[PDB]
């Protein structure tokens, strides 16, 4: 026995046919690390470690360790080795996750040599950090106090610290938090553990270094292995970490403990941070929460609620849902759903954008609405949906770019954790068929009205929280913080001042000086030679059926069909780009001549695994004329293909553009997706303004998704009630304007037996489809002026812009580009903008088909002082010496971003983008040996391209009303000001 | 809940 030799018993074993593995459980004899190592002939190989870490308090100690462990490590003694992988290396994941309970750190990749160079890195980083040796990665990633000058106030700052400020400063983040501890008040759900900002400070290096050695301990540590590697060599490889350790009780320590259920129901309201310039009668919610049970639940009840949860809120056409929004009480849904990833099973209901007086009325629908449900039950077209959607995705278990191994990881942490089998989780073929069988002999109402009836509405344990829009909370919160640092201050002596504006301007330059090329040599590297020379082959053939162009990819697909159907909008009105947005969710959330959208939508459940329309649009390398499509993307079992296009034409052609109810909630919806859209991802919205002063790709996109789109918005409510009927006829000339035989493009991957049965349901398709749309033939110019703007939002946090076209200069695309814009990235712009400056991050973005390059920040407490970093970079580039090991892990780094694995639909939607941005494979073969073969001199070259956008670029922010004043008093009329 | 690092 291999096993017993390396210190491993063999606890358990099995087959699971679920996911094609064999899955065995391994206890480590002398310490009892538990490693479930899970074997089949999935090339994504996935590792993982996860730690019990319950914490105690809201002081953020998880969340801290996790960044700092990942900030030096005994084999890896440089500032931060998890940037050294992110620059260097061929991973397809790399993350860290702190839970509420657990943290967890998994890696993956294709290629088994980087693989093992990604595992060792982590397992010494969580076994061997070097954060417990010293203060100094605590304060830097936890809190420390900063002076800039004796005569000057002392700041807080840290990188967790700025993040949880940024987090605690998001509505619906502050909402969850307010429901899961008030859930879960006697656990450890009932403390934060990312950081209340409140009481980060409250934490010494001491009790930090206590937390790692008492919970990062082999003991009290899961280990997952997933994929085609060898199985032997996985113990052998943790052997090195796990005999250098003895047996802890910590695991006893660490044991999460059960909520007891609450004998009556709690009921709170709360305060988010709000603007002053805003109606804040209109924007309260409500949320009603249960936590489910005490009891693990049996098996089927588990699977039966998660079914249940989707035939409630799976679809725009899910009772519950559907229910809520055409109530019109408020905007959107919110922290609904159920979750059932921590001890105890939790489901939540509400809705945000409630007025004032109405919050009783929302909490009266949702109890309504869920004894409606327990009393009449589910039509059986509704359960017959979810049975199919549910079966078909398990089968296609498409994680997107989401390692597949890790997905089940995370399964089977969900219940191992807790002490319970991790096997389990994994199997579903039994229980769902086990589901099916009920559901036919006893009905959906003797299933499903019991778990509503006892697990909610006979469910004592129940918290309805009330949100109010509080327009002075974050101003008060910086007082408070100025006054307690004021007597931190005044409590100091002259010397103690003077002492600490030197570990001020100490660490500053401490974390602007990067490890010289000699210290990162700790971390290695493929060879260049390790390389594929040649891109990842997609069988890729272009034909033709009824006059129109289809492109073929013949890929395992598990006798699925994905299709996509591109119609083209570049010649639409520009009074009605705005509107194609709504017309895209109206195809989906509306009915026909003969069927209501609920019928519909539930055919589309039953006999398909999905369908979505959606605008795409691009410039294209060489033209001035833009890519500009709808796409119609559909996917299905080969066997339904046949139903698929079907209903396709059906949404298409049949779908009737008359219901203004719904049409006025999709406003009201988008209002609100836009406005949280500006409030925690304002550099999206920068970006957006930027690309449309650019280019005509740009203005388009930004008229359907930013700041534009927006004030459209605004503008739509009025002429709904007002003009429905011109509304109504502007939809319906859309559609005239794209449904077309002529130039419409068909994109299918499937096997190639299934490809051939496919066709004749596509041509009848294209058969039933106008030949030629109405409307131009002329792709008219849009722009926005060019203009330096700072758009004003209520945060605490910015979102700092700045781009220029960089083939203005005359600058040829090389693909040398794409390593030195991704070494910008993760260098310059990594150590000053998010480690120096304290944004959560800051980056550089490339359009390679525009020539558009952008540098954006991410909840940055800054705004010039960002830009001024955005400017340096051609001289840190022109500074720089990169030996040939430095330039071998960016262009690896590169390849890896460009060799990135992709499941089939994936791989045949990339080169269906490829086939319409006229990037043709010997483009790409091209472009991936200038990757290859990029030097020294093309970093210098660069350097005086990108300068340009120092020079003549645009600066967009998403900032405060304080801070973009305060800018422009500095660099006077700077910015010109949208509200 | 789940905070990340990159
Ligand atoms: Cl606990
Ligand atoms: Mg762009
Ligand atoms: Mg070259
Ligand atoms: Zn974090």
Redesign the pocket.
């Known amino acids: 026995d291999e096993a017993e030799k390396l210190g491993f018993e063999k606890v358990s074993e099995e087959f699971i046919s679920e996911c094609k593995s064999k899955a065995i459980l391994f206890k480590h004899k002398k310490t009892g690390c538990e490693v479930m190592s899970v074997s089949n002939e999935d090339e994504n190989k996935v590792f993982g470690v996860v730690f019990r870490t319950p914490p105690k308090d809201s002081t953020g100690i998880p969340h801290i360790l996790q960044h700092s462990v990942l900030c030096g490590s005994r084999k890896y003694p440089v500032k931060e080795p998890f940037v050294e992988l992110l620059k260097g290396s061929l991973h397809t994941f790399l993350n860290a996750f702190t839970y509420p309970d657990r943290t967890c750190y998994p890696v993956a990749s294709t290629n088994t040599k980087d693989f093992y160079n990604l595992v060792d890195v982590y397992l010494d980083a969580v076994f061997f950090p070097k954060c417990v040796d010293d203060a100094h990665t605590f304060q830097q990633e936890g809190w420390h106090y900063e002076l800039n000058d004796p005569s000057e106030d002392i700041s807080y700052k840290g990188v967790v610290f700025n993040e949880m400020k940024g987090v605690y400063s998001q509505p619906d983040n502050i909402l969850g938090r307010i429901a899961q501890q008030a859930l879960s008040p006697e656990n450890t759900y009932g403390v934060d553990s990312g950081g209340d900002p409140k009481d980060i400070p409250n934490l010494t290096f001491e009790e930090f270094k206590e937390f790692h050695r008492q919970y990062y301990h082999p003991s009290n540590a899961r280990i997952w292995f997933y994929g085609d590697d060898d199985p032997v060599h996985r113990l052998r490889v943790l052997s090195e970490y796990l005999d250098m350790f003895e047996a802890s009780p910590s695991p006893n320590s660490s044991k999460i403990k059960f909520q007891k259920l609450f004998s009556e129901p709690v009921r709170l309201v709360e305060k988010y941070p709000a603007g002053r310039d805003g109606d804040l009668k209109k924007k309260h919610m409500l949320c009603v929460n249960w936590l489910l049970s005490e009891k693990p639940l049996d098996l089927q009840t588990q699977l039966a609620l998660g079914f249940l949860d989707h035939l409630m809120l799976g679809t725009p056409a899910s009772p519950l849902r559907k229910i809520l929004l055409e109530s019109g009480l408020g905007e959107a849904l919110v922290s609904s759903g159920l979750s059932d990833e921590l001890l105890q099973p939790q489901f939540g209901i509400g809705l945000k954008g409630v007025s004032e007086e109405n919050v009783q009325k929302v909490e009266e629908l949702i109890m309504d609405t869920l004894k409606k449900l327990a009393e009449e039950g589910f039509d059986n077209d509704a359960v017959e949906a979810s049975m199919n959607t549910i079966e078909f995705s398990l089968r296609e278990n498409n994680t997107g770019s989401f390692p597949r191994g890790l997905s089940l990881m995370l399964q089977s942490i969900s219940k191992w954790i807790y002490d319970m089998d991790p096997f389990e989780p994994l199997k579903y073929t039994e229980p769902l068929k086990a589901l099916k069988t009920r559901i036919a002999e006893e009905g959906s109402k003797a299933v499903f009205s019991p778990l509503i009836e006892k697990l909610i509405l006979n469910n004592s344990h129940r918290v309805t929280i009330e949100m109010q829009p509080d327009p002075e909370k974050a101003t008060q919160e910086e007082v408070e913080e100025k006054n307690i640092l004021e007597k931190v201050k005044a409590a100091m002596t002259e010397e103690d001042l003077a002492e600490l504006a030197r570990a001020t301007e100490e660490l500053k330059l401490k974390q602007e000086t990067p490890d010289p090329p000699e210290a990162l040599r700790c971390v290695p590297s493929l060879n260049l030679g390790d390389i594929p020379k040649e891109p990842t082959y997609v069988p890729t053939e272009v034909g033709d059926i009824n006059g129109v162009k289809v492109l073929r990819h013949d890929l395992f697909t598990n006798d699925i069909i994905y299709t996509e159907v591109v119609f083209d909008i570049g010649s639409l009105k520009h009074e009605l780009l705005p509107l194609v947005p709504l017309f895209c969710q109206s195809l989906l959330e509306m009915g026909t001549k003969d069927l209501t959208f609920v019928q519909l939508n539930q055919l589309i459940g039953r006999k398909t695994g999905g369908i979505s329309v959606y605008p795409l649009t691009s410039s294209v390398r060489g033209k001035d004329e833009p890519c500009s499509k709808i796409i119609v993307r559909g996917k299905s079992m080969a066997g339904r293909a046949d139903d698929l296009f079907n209903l396709m034409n059906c949404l298409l052609q049949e779908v009737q553009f008359t219901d203004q109810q719904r049409f006025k909630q999709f406003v009201s919806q988008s209002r609100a997706r836009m406005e949280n859209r500006l409030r925690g991802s304002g550099h999206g919205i920068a970006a957006a303004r930027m690309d449309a002063m650019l280019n005509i790709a740009g203005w388009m996109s930004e008229q359907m998704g930013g700041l534009s789109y927006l004030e459209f918005l605004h503008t739509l409510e009025k002429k709904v009630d007002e003009d429905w009927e011109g509304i109504s006829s502007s939809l319906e000339e859309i559609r005239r304007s794209l449904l077309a035989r002529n130039g419409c493009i068909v994109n299918m991957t499937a096997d190639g037996k299934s490809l051939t049965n496919v066709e004749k349901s596509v041509a009848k398709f294209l058969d039933l489809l106008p030949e030629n749309p109405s409307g131009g033939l002329v792709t008219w110019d849009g722009r926005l002026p060019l203009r330096n703007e700072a758009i004003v939002i209520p945060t605490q946090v910015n979102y700092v812009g700045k781009a220029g076209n960089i083939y203005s200069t005359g600058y040829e695309l ?3 580009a794409y390593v030195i814009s991704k070494h910008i990235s993760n260098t310059w712009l990594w150590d000053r903008v998010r480690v120096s400056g304290g944004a959560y991050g800051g980056f550089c973005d490339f359009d390679s088909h525009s020539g558009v390059f952008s540098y954006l920040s991410y909840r940055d407490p800054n705004l010039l002082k960002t830009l001024d970093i955005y400017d340096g970079t051609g001289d840190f580039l022109r500074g720089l010496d990169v030996d040939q090991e430095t330039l071998t892990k960016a262009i690896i780094g590169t390849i890896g971003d460009v060799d990135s694995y992709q499941l089939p639909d994936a791989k045949g939607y990339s080169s269906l983008l490829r086939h319409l941005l006229g990037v043709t494979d010997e483009e790409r073969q091209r472009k991936r040996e ?1 990757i290859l ?3 020294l001199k ?1 970093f210098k070259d660069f350097a005086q391209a990108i300068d340009v956008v120092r020079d003549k670029g645009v600066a967009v922010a998403v900032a405060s009303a304080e801070d973009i004043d305060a800018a422009n008093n500095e660099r006077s009329n700077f910015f010109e000001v949208k509200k | 809940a789940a905070l990340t690092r990159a």
């Open positions: 090389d693909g040398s200038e073969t990029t030097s093309d």
